[PDB]
Nucleic acid binder design. Structure first.
Ligand SMILES: [Mg+2]
Lengths: 97, 87, 95, 106, 97, 82, 106, 95
DNA sequence: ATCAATATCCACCTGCAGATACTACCAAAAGTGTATTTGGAAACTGCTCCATCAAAAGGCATGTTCAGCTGATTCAGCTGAACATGCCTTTTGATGGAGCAGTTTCCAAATACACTTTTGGTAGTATCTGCAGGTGGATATTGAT
DNA sequence: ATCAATATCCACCTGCAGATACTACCAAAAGTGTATTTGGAAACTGCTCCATCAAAAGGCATGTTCAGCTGAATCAGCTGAACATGCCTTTTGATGGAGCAGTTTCCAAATACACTTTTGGTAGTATCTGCAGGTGGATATTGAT
């Protein structure tokens, strides 16, 4: 019976994911989500597959940057745990509100 | 075309593990349970804004297909320029 | 000596329709003028871009329209689009 | 002779707008409706702001609109605020707003 | 023998200054600072009166707004006192750092 | 009484600005920090304005030189032309 | 029988850059030096990024520059990082960077 | 089968110049292609505005020059200005 | 609570900075009539690639467990707020002169147009090679003790 | 520290994807040359409006005092990380047509040029007034007790 202490796999993962460049959201789920939102703006639309890829690349890049900013907000609060309030502070300061 | 499957609740395909991976790439060690819904919301707003503009470009061109270029131009307007897809 | 143009008098005409008993400071009018010039450039700029994206040599009201949609927030876009299509109808039918 | 503005029922100069578009290198060519459309939109947006800035003047017991009135008008309206969200109105100050945790205890 | 509690005048001033629109830096000091800075870019420079004004309007707007985000950052860390870190966090998230 | 111009931006003036921004209590170190930030702001804007001046073969920075610099820095200002 | 590129001592295409300036409606007229000067700047910047990207390829024991290398190049260089501070390189990933307080012990 | 142009062969030439044994993936080339188009559009835009602001109808190498000083940061600007000046001087004398 | 120091409120008054009003004016747009050039919907159809179906590769959901993080409590001490005004810096106003802006000039350089050549793209079919993803095998990191 | 469970780092290999290659060709380029149009530098100069400075205004540098904030120390409760486990969902590879995108004809529309009419910026002189800034006194707010 063996166990890593909480935080050890987490750091392992940070090193792993910061080292690679593959998209981290599954393709199809993300694709449905796009098609859904789009349909709600306009019916009977098609997407070039690269257009979905473009969106996915943008979206993941946006979200990863948002989390660094979020992480900074937590740390500023003397925490190591990101919370919705941190995301909210980031987005206000960023002028997304 | 006969029949056209109903899309609903797809936001949920952005799973807890996928969101954890993105946090990791973003250098986050610890994630409170409430982050996942919050992230889903934020992603939804992000996509709506980009897809609206993308689709607007599509319609202006009188097309039914959204191009890599429509998204690239939408991304540019919103100050999130993307390289790697024709723009 | 050289004539320095401004939207100031048109702004002033519109002020009166909207608030006939209300005046406007110089500084305020300057700001209103900036505003018009700014939005002018933003809309024209987007329309230019649109034309180019679609290999077209002309900026037509369709471009200004899509431009307005892309630039203006929800409700403001809608009303502006309606005022826009209105003005073009009225202008066409008039001899 | 009758101005294109009066033909389109507009206080805003269709003629000038037309010209400014040509000498703006926006495209090779410029359709006839574009300046009409464009001018309407500008008139429209001018009215909205003047309306709300007037109201703002009224509130503060004034008949002359000043920058402060344009600022209060724009930042108290969600949609105008967003359109002008990277704009500074000279001599506008800010909306009165104090974070509640900064208020003394009851 | 009458003294106001810490923060009473602070609140009073917030209300006062949030209500007015005058510039809050003295014209002359600011004009010198502008000219000194411009000197490193080109010598023998003259400035329109309105150009110095425009710079002041923009600087004070900028700084007032940064104090808003800064204040939010202090509050986020459960404080009521703005500190250089709060300015730093704000500028980092704004993408100025 | 020899003194840097940056110091002309005084404690009370910085305090007033904070106040307009809704700030109640201010750490002593804020004043130097703010001066630093303001200096970078003016540098960036002035650099760009002067660049407009030089281009126009002038020796006077015009309000329009500033207004244009502000516009490309993403800080559009209304009320000084353009 | 000589191209303007060779005349200017450039790899990048002066003719092409001339052509693209005209159709972009940036101004009525395009001077003769403009495409020359711009094509040079273009070539300078692309050389600068390729140098740095090449090094990142080599630091990883690779022979073919891929997007990750471009990203390592840009993000590691203060000036290229600012020039492209609002741009995203598809397939570029991020820089390894874990904040201090997150690491183990004291 | 419409002809889609890019800067790819020029990026490749310059690549050979600096790193003679290094190749580039087609995605990496795509990004390189995007980057040139981007910087081109950004310089051409600044040049465009600059001309207008100065009531000029012509974009000369002087306009490009200021655009470069406006757009690029410090050291990249210094060096880019050399290389463009160098190319124009060498262009003028070369006929 | 009460008591008093001071800030805040409203009303009314008043001089003038800054607004609206005005006519000449003339010059420069904007609009009107005539001849020219050009763009882009509609009609048509090759053909890319998008949507939509079945089989294989591995990531997701869920429950359990407890490590350690968060957020409450308390508290000492440090640090920023408030305070009074003579003192020194900024503001207001007075006046030469830099330079910016208006104007006219003329030419080097730009547009235009018309063969003439070069080249950058693709397409067809081939031909080579960097490296991703598999294996096993030797060394680091981590956590119990 | 010692042991050991597990991750990590090499090194070496091998199919094959995707990259470099090449031969045919061509349309759209870029180049060359000669004709005609003009933008803007260049030079003189007139008048703002900008730097400078004396006198008048008034905001701030000072140090002292202590309320109340920040941050360290401590702790219980419980959230969120780790991991084992069962299997559903995505990924990968191979077959039909909506629609995009490429060609062409053709007129409805924008350009151009010159002309004739008015509008809008300025300046002139004067014309007018909304309100900032001051008074007075009534009432609210804050803080001491
Ligand atoms: Mg739906």
């Amino acid at each position: 019976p063996h166990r890593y202490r909480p935080g050890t796999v987490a750091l392992r993962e940070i090193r792993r994911y910061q080292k690679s460049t593959e998209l981290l959201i599954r393709k199809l789920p993300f694709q449905r989500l796009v098609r859904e939102i789009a349909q709600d703006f306009k019916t009977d639309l098609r997407f070039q597959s690269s257009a979905v890829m473009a969106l996915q690349e943008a979206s993941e890049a946006y979200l990863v940057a948002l989390f660094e900013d979020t992480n900074l907000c937590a740390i500023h609060a003397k925490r190591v745990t990101i919370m919705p309030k941190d995301i909210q502070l980031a987005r206000r300061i960023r002028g997304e509100r | 075309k006969r029949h056209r499957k109903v899309l609903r609740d797809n936001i949920q395909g952005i799973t807890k593990p996928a969101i954890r991976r993105l946090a990791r790439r973003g250098g986050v060690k610890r994630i409170s349970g409430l982050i996942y819904e919050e992230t889903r919301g934020v992603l939804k707003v992000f996509l709506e804004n980009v897809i609206r503009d993308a689709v607007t470009y599509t319609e202006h061109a009188k097309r039914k297909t959204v191009t890599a270029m429509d998204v690239v131009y939408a991304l540019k307007r919103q100050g999130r320029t993307l390289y790697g897809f024709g723009g | 000596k050289t004539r320095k143009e401004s939207y100031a008098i048109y702004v002033y005409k519109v002020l009166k329709q909207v608030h006939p008993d209300t005046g406007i400071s110089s500084k305020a009018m300057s700001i209103m003028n900036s505003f018009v010039n700014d939005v002018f450039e933003r809309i024209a700029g987007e329309a230019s871009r649109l034309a180019h994206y679609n290999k077209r040599s002309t900026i037509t009201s369709r471009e200004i329209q899509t431009a307005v949609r892309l630039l203006l927030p929800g409700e403001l876009a809608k009303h502006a689009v309606s005022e826009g299509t209105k003005a073009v109808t009225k202008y066409t039918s008039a001899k | 002779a009758k101005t294109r503005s009066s033909r389109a029922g507009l206080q805003f100069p269709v003629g000038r707008v037309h010209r400014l578009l040509r000498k703006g290198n926006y495209a090779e060519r410029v359709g006839a409706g574009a300046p009409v459309y464009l001018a309407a939109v500008l008139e429209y947006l001018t009215a909205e702001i003047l309306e709300l800035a007037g109201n703002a003047a009224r509130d503060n017991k004034k008949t002359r609109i000043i920058p402060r009135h344009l600022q209060l008008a724009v930042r108290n309206d969600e949609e105008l605020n967003k359109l002008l969200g990277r704009v500074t109105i000279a001599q506008g100050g800010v909306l009165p707003n104090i974070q509640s945790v900064l208020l003394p205890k009851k």
